[PDB]
Write a protein that binds this ligand. Structure first.
Ligand SMILES: Cc1nc2ccc(C(=O)NCc3ccccc3)cc2n2c(-c3ccccc3)nnc12
Ligand SMILES: [Mg+2]
Ligand SMILES: [Zn+2]
Length: 340
């Protein structure tokens, strides 16, 4: 209760008081210490005027925010700080790219809340592993796909249906249903499999030009912005990309270890013996990350800097790829590592 007490009664700090650069793309939200992140969630909500506009109950909101935070486990990458930094990028798009000209207020509110909840209760493993290991989640959800993402959605709903946690309690039936509909759509788009299916449609949308009167264009745009948030670590400095590669490949390799204890051949990228991290990083950037921010740039001309930094961070990887080949002796002055 003490964290809840202080988060509820101390008041909401202004976004500038968190960091002077808080509303800028150049700022890295991972540098904020975890114990401050719940306050920063409230301050962003305050600053986007969602608390006032939707008359969100503050006691309810405090509990909800902490419940979402304590709904994340602690694998190398898919932990609370990922959700937080993903939500922050959603805040950055609101401040810097004028989402109100494209999207309804409620759709913008949904995206931000979806960002907070999109990876709840993740276990450092992807959808394929759920079927392979025959986990509880596959048993539930494998027949429509997007296993983890459906679980992510279900967990967020469980948080809403916990007593005193339903930040939308006072919404009309029609607003409540719209908000949960949005959360379904938005969270399921976090499966990169989904993104790859809607990619042609996203290109179509960019070519012809955005149409605020077109209901499909809203749905498509909402998906693109979610993925943009989900991969937003790539739009920062080189250093952030470096660290995030380290965290995800730790997570991934751990899965591989389990897969081959269960007698399966992991996919190259899960395999610590086979995975060449430089080619995999560049490949993810080229085929997945870069074209997303290209499309984001195509729809928002003010999002050019984001594509530019991802493109530059890709160049940075190619330049450092040679450090993965050992020259001379490895500073041990030993070649004991070869006895196998
Ligand atoms: C840095 C990085 N590399 C990834 C490499 C590889 C992958 C990854 O899952 N690739 C395989 C894949 C691609 C397309 C569709 C289905 C499966 C993800 C990476 N990633 C993410 C991420 C992970 C899971 C879900 C959503 C996003 N976020 N950052 C990364
Ligand atoms: Mg996910
Ligand atoms: Zn994610």
């Amino acid at each position: 209760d003490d964290e809840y007490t202080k988060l509820l009664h101390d008041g909401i700090q202004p976004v500038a008081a968190i960091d002077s650069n808080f509303a800028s793309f150049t700022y890295t939200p991972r540098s904020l210490p975890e114990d401050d992140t719940s306050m920063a969630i409230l301050s962003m909500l305050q600053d986007m005027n969602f608390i006032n506009n939707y008359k969100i109950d503050c006691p309810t909101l405090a509990r909800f925010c902490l419940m979402v935070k304590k709904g994340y486990r602690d694998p190398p990458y898919h932990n609370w700080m990922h959700a937080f930094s993903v939500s922050h990028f959603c805040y950055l798009l609101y401040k810097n790219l004028e989402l109100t000209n494209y999207l309804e207020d409620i759709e913008i509110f949904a995206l931000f809340i979806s960002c907070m909840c999109h990876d709840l209760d993740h276990r450092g493993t992807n959808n394929s592993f759920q079927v392979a290991s025959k986990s509880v989640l596959a048993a539930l959800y494998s027949s429509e796909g997007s296993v983890m993402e459906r679980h992510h959605f279900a967990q967020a709903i469980a948080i809403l249906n916990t007593h005193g946690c339903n930040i939308f309690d006072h919404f009309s039936r029609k607003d409540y249903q719209r908000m949960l509909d949005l959360m379904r759509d938005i969270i399921l788009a976090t499966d990169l499999a989904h993104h790859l299916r809607i990619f042609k449609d996203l290109q179509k949308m960019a070519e012809v030009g955005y149409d605020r009167n077109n209901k499909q264009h809203h749905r498509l745009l909402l998906c693109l912005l979610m993925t943009s948030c989900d991969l937003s670590d790539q739009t920062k400095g080189w250093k952030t990309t470096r660290k995030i590669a380290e965290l995800i490949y730790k997570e991934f390799f751990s899965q591989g270890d389990l897969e081959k204890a269960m007698g399966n051949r992991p996919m190259e990228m899960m395999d610590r013996e086979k995975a060449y991290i430089p080619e995999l990083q560049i490949s993810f950037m080229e085929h997945i990350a870069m074209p997303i921010y290209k499309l984001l740039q195509d729809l928002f001309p003010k999002a050019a800097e984001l594509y530019e930094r991802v493109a530059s961070n890709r160049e940075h990887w190619t330049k450092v790829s040679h450090k993965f080949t050992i020259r001379g002796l490895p500073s041990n002055n030993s070649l004991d590592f070869l006895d196998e």
